[PDB]
Amino acid sequence: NPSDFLSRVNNFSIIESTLREGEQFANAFFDTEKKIQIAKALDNFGVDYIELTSPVASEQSRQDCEAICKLGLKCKILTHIRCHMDDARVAVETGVDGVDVVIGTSMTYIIDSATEVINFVKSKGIEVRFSSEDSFRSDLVDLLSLYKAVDKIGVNRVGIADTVGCATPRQVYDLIRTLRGVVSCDIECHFHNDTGMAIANAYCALEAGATHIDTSILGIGERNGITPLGALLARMYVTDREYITHKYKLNQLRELENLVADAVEVQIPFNNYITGMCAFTHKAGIHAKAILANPSTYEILKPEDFGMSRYVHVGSRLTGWNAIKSRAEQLNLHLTDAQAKELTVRIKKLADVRTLAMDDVDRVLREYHA
Amino acid sequence: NPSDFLSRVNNFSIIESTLREGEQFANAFFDTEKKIQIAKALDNFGVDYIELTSPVASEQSRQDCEAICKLGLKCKILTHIRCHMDDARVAVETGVDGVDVVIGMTYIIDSATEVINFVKSKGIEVRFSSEDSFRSDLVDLLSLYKAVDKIGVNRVGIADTVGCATPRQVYDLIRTLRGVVSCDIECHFHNDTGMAIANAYCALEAGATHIDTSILGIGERNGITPLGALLARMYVTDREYITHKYKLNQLRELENLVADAVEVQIPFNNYITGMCAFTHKAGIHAKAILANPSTYEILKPEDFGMSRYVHVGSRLTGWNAIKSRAEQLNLHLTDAQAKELTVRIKKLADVRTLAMDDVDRVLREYHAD
Ligand SMILES: N[C@@H](CCCC[NH3+])C(=O)O
Numbered sequence: 001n002p003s004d005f006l007s008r009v010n011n012f013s014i015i016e017s018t019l020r021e022g023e024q025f026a027n028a029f030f031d032t033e034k035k036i037q038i039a040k041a042l043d044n045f046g047v048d049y050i051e052l053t054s055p056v057a058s059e060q061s062r063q064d065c066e067a068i069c070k071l072g073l074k075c076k077i078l079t080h081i082r083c084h085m086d087d088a089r090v091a092v093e094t095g096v097d098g099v100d101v102v103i104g105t106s107m108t109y110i111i112d113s114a115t116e117v118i119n120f121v122k123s124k125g126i127e128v129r130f131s132s133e134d135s136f137r138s139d140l141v142d143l144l145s146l147y148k149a150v151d152k153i154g155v156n157r158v159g160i161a162d163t164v165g166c167a168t169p170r171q172v173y174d175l176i177r178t179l180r181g182v183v184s185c186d187i188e189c190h191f192h193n194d195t196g197m198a199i200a201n202a203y204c205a206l207e208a209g210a211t212h213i214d215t216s217i218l219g220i221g222e223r224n225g226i227t228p229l230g231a232l233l234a235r236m237y238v239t240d241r242e243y244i245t246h247k248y249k250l251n252q253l254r255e256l257e258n259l260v261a262d263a264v265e266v267q268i269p270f271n272n273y274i275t276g277m278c279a280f281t282h283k284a285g286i287h288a289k290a291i292l293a294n295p296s297t298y299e300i301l302k303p304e305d306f307g308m309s310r311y312v313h314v315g316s317r318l319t320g321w322n323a324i325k326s327r328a329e330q331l332n333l334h335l336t337d338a339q340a341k342e343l344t345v346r347i348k349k350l351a352d353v354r355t356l357a358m359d360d361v362d363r364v365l366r367e368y369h370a
Numbered sequence: 371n372p373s374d375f376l377s378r379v380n381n382f383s384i385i386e387s388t389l390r391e392g393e394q395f396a397n398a399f400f401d402t403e404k405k406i407q408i409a410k411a412l413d414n415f416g417v418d419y420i421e422l423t424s425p426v427a428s429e430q431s432r433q434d435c436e437a438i439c440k441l442g443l444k445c446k447i448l449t450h451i452r453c454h455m456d457d458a459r460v461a462v463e464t465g466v467d468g469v470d471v472v473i474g475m476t477y478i479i480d481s482a483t484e485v486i487n488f489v490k491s492k493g494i495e496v497r498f499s500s501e502d503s504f505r506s507d508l509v510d511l512l513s514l515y516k517a518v519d520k521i522g523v524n525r526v527g528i529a530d531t532v533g534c535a536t537p538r539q540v541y542d543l544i545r546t547l548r549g550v551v552s553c554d555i556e557c558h559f560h561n562d563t564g565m566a567i568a569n570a571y572c573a574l575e576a577g578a579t580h581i582d583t584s585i586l587g588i589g590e591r592n593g594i595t596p597l598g599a600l601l602a603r604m605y606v607t608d609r610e611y612i613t614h615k616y617k618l619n620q621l622r623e624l625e626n627l628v629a630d631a632v633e634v635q636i637p638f639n640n641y642i643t644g645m646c647a648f649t650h651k652a653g654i655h656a657k658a659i660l661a662n663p664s665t666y667e668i669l670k671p672e673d674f675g676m677s678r679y680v681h682v683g684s685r686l687t688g689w690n691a692i693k694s695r696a697e698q699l700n701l702h703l704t705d706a707q708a709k710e711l712t713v714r715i716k717k718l719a720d721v722r723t724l725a726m727d728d729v730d731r732v733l734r735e736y737h738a739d
């Protein structure tokens with residue numbers, strides 16, 4: 001009971017990191033124009049913050065950070081620096097709303113260096129966050145003493161980052177809960193998905209009092225990336241439907257993912273949360289009898305909350321035009337006769353070149369909107 | 371730290387359910403021969419149990435269950451039934467090693483006693499499970515497991531059929547169940563909200579002894595705990611245990627075998643075997659972290675049959691992209707093979723723009739060593 005009072009499950013902010021973490025994705029090479037498209041779409045979608053690659057990284061990186069701060073977006077624009085006064089100056093000139101100071105223990109000297117940079121940023125009227133890299137493989141007592149010191153100085157947020165992807169949910173819960181007892185400020189969390197824990201860790205972090213979670217569209221990032229944006233929203237929606245459906249424009253998630261999928265040349269995985277081919281499907285037939293209750297009894301995600309029309313009850317392999325129509329009708333693409341013709345021409349010239357895959361259905365449909 | 375004594379993180383069994391949960395996957399239509407292939411590959415990979423679609427489901431289900439029990443596999447073959455005596459008779463005749471009795475208050479426990487004792491009298495292992503355990507009345511559920519434990523079963527089963535359970539709620543439930551019963555505990559987790567691997571992990575921490583998985587997680591809706599994903603997690607917790615128990619270098623072929631049968635791509639971000647799993651960004655974006663990218667390698671590629679993390683500077687295109695990935699996968703490609711692959715890769719880009727998913731797709735037909 002009492003700890004429910006600290007839970008942030010229906011009162012948190014997303015720090016969208018497709019334009020920071022996502023630039024570490026193996027196939028991400030965003031140009032200025034494509035970053036701007038993504039920033040605008042993220043803002044329309046309803047995230048509170050977007051984070052950008054450090055403006056010290058490169059020239060184009062500094063220019064793009066300046067351009068994005070000039071767009072008039074509703075969400076706040078963040079970036080990050082190393083703990084050097086040099087970098088801080090560059091960052092505050094760009095027009096960002098906040099700066100993360102990142103350090104690694106991954107001792108008395110850290111506290112001193114960190115104070116100069118924190119007060120400089122603060123004096124420029126800018127939000128300041130203080131974070132550690134590889135927080136779960138850093139000495140616990142040193143880490144916490146450091147957060148305590150910077151809390152006494154005054155920052156807006158402190159950050160925990162599982163950079164390596166080894167943290168487990170109850171381990172995260174316990175650390176965040178202790179951090180929540182040590183500091184008086186807000187708490188942001190960043191979780192790598194190497195072992196499948198990035199969404200679970202995000203959730204436990206919120207339960208323990210974290211106020212801000214980093215996400216990435218389709219989870220793109222270093223290695224297999226971080227907490228996916230869509231995946232977190234699916235989880236948080238189950239916890240509080242009315243909060244998530246009103247805060248975000250959930251019916252825009254598919255277009256937002258397709259925009260990134262195009263840029264980084266990937267297919268939306270068949271089992272992607274919400275938007276994957278198979279996410280809103282039930283098996284009909286001899287295999288529906290494999291559970292005791294009717295398949296429709298298990299619909300934790302309501303399809304129309306996410307812009308879709310139904311669960312598809314699959315009893316046979318739908319092939320050709322049949323597969324396209326079903327998926328298109330599920331996605332609310334009201335396809336004209338002329339559109340239906342191209343698709344079955346493209347879908348043929350595809351299957352004739354190579355034996356068709358379930359993923360190809362969504363792939364040939366990408367170019368279409370509701 | 372006393373509860374560490376109850377943890378099963380380095381001492382557990384996998385109940386592989388590609389041939390039960392997986393048949394509920396939208397595009398799964400396995401024939402006898404394909405089931406037999408998957409069952410043999412699973413046994414070689416080293417899982418302790420496979421689960422099969424109930425032999426009451428259809429004629430072909432019944433036939434396929436019989437055939438698989440006759441293959442001489444090392445792993446135990448399980449099936450499941452409803453709490454009905456007729457179903458029990460069919461199941462025991464098939465030659466399975468174990469039967470799960472699945473239910474949805476006094477009437478339940480009388481019927482359950484009847485079925486359990488029958489199965490036990492055949493010298494077959496018996497498991498008692500509930501469907502949608504996390505949306506059932508807690509006190510009725512636990513009283514039920516207690517009663518069934520006094521009768522004596524080999525295992526009790528918790529199933530998050532709907533995919534709403536959270537890791538700490540899983541931990542508390544399994545932990546209470548471990549206090550209530552004296553027997554083994556199996557857990558089944560759906561992945562609608564991304565919690566299936568975390569729930570599996572927490573269940574092991576709390577004393578569960580058996581976890582259901584599926585290849586690529588395939589199952590009803592977006593499926594259950596994935597086989598590869600669970601092993602990646604469990605490998606980090608105990609590398610020596612996982613690497614000596616499973617044949618992890620056969621994971622890719624195992625997934626490709628299923629992927630081909632159910633007509634899907636291997637997702638770009640798939641645990642271990644996805645295009646991107648063993649990649650670092652090189653360049654201006656390597657500077658986004660403080661430490662060298664190679665500091666963050668919780669999974670060692672050579673433990674999973676791979677040769678390196680690929681350090682990505684530019685966009686590798688054409689045969690340059692194929693070569694990089696084939697060398698990562700230890701596919702020693704002949705000049706003849708390298709030729710035909712370059713032929714196809716263009717005879718595909720000339721139909722449309724290449725996804726990085728395509729690289730793994732054209733490589734599927736190729737084996738290591
Ligand atoms: N990619 C960085 C992000 C740290 C974010 C800190 N606010 C990491 O994994 O450590």
Ligand SMILES: N[C@@H](CCCC[NH3+])C(=O)O
Pocket residue numbers: 290291391470472499500501502527528529530531532556558560
């Ligand atoms: N498909 C069933 C499997 C139950 C397994 C119980 N041993 C479910 O999700 O509930």
Ligand code: NA
Pocket residue numbers: 180181182183184
């Ligand atoms: Na406090």
Ligand code: NA
Pocket residue numbers: 548549550551552
């Ligand atoms: Na006990």
Ligand SMILES: [Zn+2]
Pocket residue numbers: 021163190192221222226
């Ligand atoms: Zn990161």
Ligand SMILES: [Zn+2]
Pocket residue numbers: 391531558560589590594
């Ligand atoms: Zn299931």
